[PDB]
Point group: D2
Chain length 333, copies 4
């Protein structure tokens, strides 16, 4: 299988294409489904507010995109069951619309003639993969798999290293997170979520995330031991996750940091920095998560000890690089 369809050519969907081409994958994107014309998807692909001009040629026809000389079909089917995946033989669907985050929903891509589905979001009780953490759990028999959220790919490698070195007995996270398409431009209805209805570029907005609640799926031993949430803020991309943990051993900052450095060495998914970076330095990062040793903090009072560890993430591109790693491997089995 090296024949891929993208459902939802949005922020994540367009970067999936950018990244496959950046690394010369032997995967060919042959079809795209969205809700618009080829002309509009081409304008969007060619001109990116966050990452600049497309590095390759982009043109269109009435029913297709021409990207670096290759034709890619464009469909506009609102319901995934009606998508002609069979037409160009789309074998693996990268599902990035947000409207098919379950086994039962992404089932419709199978019923429309696809073999597998990789969902770019948490998708309930299914095999959920952070690359370089639990991707060894994938087999030939898997059809519909999830890569969880940007936050889950940030949190998990940091949690994994802490759990391996020290044990995490209990923990809570806060991610300070760039605003996304789920939020609003101006104050107005955004389904049931009251907070999501508020102008995203003019507010700090508390926001639910299951990254920590559903970490059980990626790190089985931490199942039900983490909770967390987000504060969405007015940066366009680039985020950071703080974890506060009661660990299984007394530790020093240097000790926590050395252990993290160890876990990041020749680790293409998980980086390290000892530099005084800010969110914009993470934009275009090729990691899922970059641990920041400068923000490590140990608060100790006797027996009791709280350990704050902080990792950066490019929630768009960084998360994507993880999505592509997982995709390449899903596609070889």
């Amino acid at each position: 299988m090296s024949k891929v369809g993208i459902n939802g050519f949005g922020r994540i969907g367009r970067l999936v294409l950018r990244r496959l081409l950046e690394v010369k994958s032997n995967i060919d994107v042959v079809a795209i489904n969205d809700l618009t014309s080829p002309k509009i998807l081409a304008y969007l692909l060619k001109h990116d507010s966050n990452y600049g001009p497309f590095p390759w040629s982009v043109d269109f026809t009435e029913d297709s995109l021409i990207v670096d000389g290759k034709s890619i079909a464009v469909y506009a089917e609102k319901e995934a069951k009606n998508i002609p995946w069979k037409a160009k033989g789309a074998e693996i669907i990268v599902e990035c619309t947000g409207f098919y985050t379950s086994a039962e929903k992404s089932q419709a891509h199978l019923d429309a003639g696809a073999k597998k589905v990789l969902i770019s979001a948490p998708a309930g009780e299914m095999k959920t993969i952070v690359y370089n953490v639990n991707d060894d759990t994938l087999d030939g028999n898997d059809t519909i798999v999830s890569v969880a959220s940007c936050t889950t790919n940030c949190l998990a490698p940091m949690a994994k290293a802490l759990h391996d070195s020290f044990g995490i007995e209990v923990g809570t996270m806060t991610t300070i997170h760039a605003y996304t398409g789920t939020q609003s431009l101006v104050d107005g209805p955004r389904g049931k979520d009251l907070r999501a209805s508020r102008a995203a570029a003019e507010n700090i907005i508390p926001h639910t995330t299951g990254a920590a609640k559903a970490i059980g799926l990626v790190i089985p031993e931490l199942s039900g031991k983490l909770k967390g949430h987000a504060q969405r803020v007015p940066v366009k991309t680039g985020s950071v996750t703080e974890l506060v943990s009661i660990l299984g051993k007394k530790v020093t900052a240097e000790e926590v940091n050395n252990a993290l450095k160890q876990a990041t060495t020749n680790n293409e998914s998980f980086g390290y920095t000892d530099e005084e970076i800010v969110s914009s330095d993470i934009i275009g990062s090729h990691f899922g998560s970059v641990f920041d040793a400068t923000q490590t903090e140990i608060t100790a009072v006797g027996d009791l000890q709280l350990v704050k560890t902080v990792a950066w993430y490019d929630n768009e591109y960084g998360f994507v690089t993880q999505l592509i790693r997982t995709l390449e491997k899903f596609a070889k089995l």
Copy 2:
């Protein structure tokens, strides 16, 4: 005399319509609201405003209503206007603020649904179109559907009218540097067919079409076909400014243009004047439709060839709403 109002589209404009009605202690009585959501969500949005802060009156809700300052207001959720039960509470004048009924053909559905008149908060083609204190004397008892044009029109028109009256505008072109609005996009993604509107509004200067100058003839007939213009949408949440570059009908100095504008703003509740070094946030919550800024006036001349740039600020949300309400209160007494 016609005191009972329905609001269709309880959005940025619709919410502030109510805020401004209560602020001026109008005898107009908002009896019903229609939108696409629950009373709970509307009540949340009404209490809490990112641009203007906490609502100055109490806000609660029921399964089917808002309770604002102790007074009950019915809430309906009908997406097609012809199905709004305006008769239940005797809603007579509908303030149409959804963006989806911007023509006589479309807004007449409120009449079908049992209302008496419609005031549309946006341009709506070739119909009676009013900028208060510019052409509100053209209203009469036979007007049943009326437009107040756009924020931009309520800014430009009084500046243009003043220049028309004192000097003549032979030809001109407008550019408005305008706050982003809910028609734009939060992140890069499709936004109908307008390519530019697909781009992240808070992270970009975005060129944007607007008919304010194009359709000025509806408000000042003698300027019909003599102006063009466009917008540059920028990352401020509200507050905007309009520059007009004109060939006037007479040779002028900057001091002469400013005195003529000052005279037009004197005792004019719709049209302010300033020569303070203000910036956009100083216009947020303005009670004018337009505020002429004398500090930005510029005369460029070479022999007989003269270009005149005049500039006016406007709070495209609340300030425009003050005009909307002035127009509503007159409409209702006809």
Copy 3:
């Protein structure tokens, strides 16, 4: 009827709102003098036009050496060094110190040398009486001459910590505040003292930032010295900020139980408010509280007998902090 005469040093974001708040509440204090680094014209323009709070609610004019505010004169000086400020010329006896450059006993001493009697500093100023109104203002007496009101963050954190302490005990905790950007940061990438992160464009980044609010909490709640640490993340909102605290408390608790203890702590408490509405930061702008506890963000995380407790409070680091500074100033001035 006590009419203390006040001078303001540093007519900045905080200094200006101090005057705004004093007139807003009709305080008996008269502000008789202001010192900054500029002309009365520039100070008048800034007082009149405010990007966060809108137009000044009172008339503002200037002469070559004064502001005229609602028809009252306020002398204007421009003395880089506080010892040269002529506070005696208009009888200014209580200086509200808001420049950032006199944050110690030894430095603010200069206001007394120059003829003032008391100084209240609008920031942490080391080992000195450090007041969060409605937490420890009863430590104030007639013998105090130089006092601090700590930071905005201390004024957010201390009431929430106080109530948790009083109700449950806190064994240990750690704080993160997601904080509006301020004048100590940069507009564009460029040198800002010695703090590398402060050099980066404030409106375009999440910027980690050290704050002493947790570390020095003991000056305000002595039982908690050494028990808390924390830091900030600076983000692109112009004002309005939120403080999270992750605590191990000395009792097992539920969320409801935590939220009820906080509610009771906020009852008839002019300094410390409560919400259970789904507010966001722009809803805190213009708050008349130093801190507003948010019941909606309370989180208990539990395994066996291990419980982590997250509590969260909003604050307008500008106006809200200023209401606290003014309460503290009214009491300080009457002693």
Copy 4:
């Protein structure tokens, strides 16, 4: 030799100057940098850029130097240019990017400090002022202090040149909608005597004077006195756009203007062309001084009279910098 360069002001422009020189593999050799801080801090700023991302070469520092791509650059901290020890490493041409030496009299100080020539990164009064590919042919061997004018001059000049050559410009006025810069304020507070410059830059539309139009005569002598203009500073970090409204010497169509402009941009490394529906973030990183935008051309005509609006984008940081470097590469070989 004249291949050895010092940078005064290692700021937004100073650092991108070094970035650009390395990017085009110039045989210019930056031997010295002066600013007001430590090499630690300069190294941190060069390595990590909020607008352009990570520096593409290595950066380390010592107590008195930077090491950029393995090459040592001396760092001084002399707030008065007369005291900068340029002779120590033999800096002959100074790229003056502080903003504090924007006159012949002031930049003379670099020559008394032992340098041979100064290139000022801003307007600087009546001295030879260069927009590359408009009037770089005017530089000669004897010039010791020159200007590259502003970002806005580099954007306006080539558009005005093309219009001037093809149709004549009788008179015209300009408005640039311009990214905020370091002369503005993060929070409301004193900023010298420009009142508007004291207002929070990322929360306002802020009008602002610029000499781009007024001083155009230095770059295109025939347009001396024929243009005026100003800016509206808005909340984007870099990337700007310039609109010019002109009375031309001929009657024209939109297509005719667009084709003339397209001709002037053909094989022009300094002056780009687009007919794509771009927005400001699309110009960030541009290797042009100016990119004419055909999509925004507008002809407003009534009988005999005509106004023509033409629009060009520019990356006021990197794009302007690319013109500065073209000019410096010629300057160094005269």
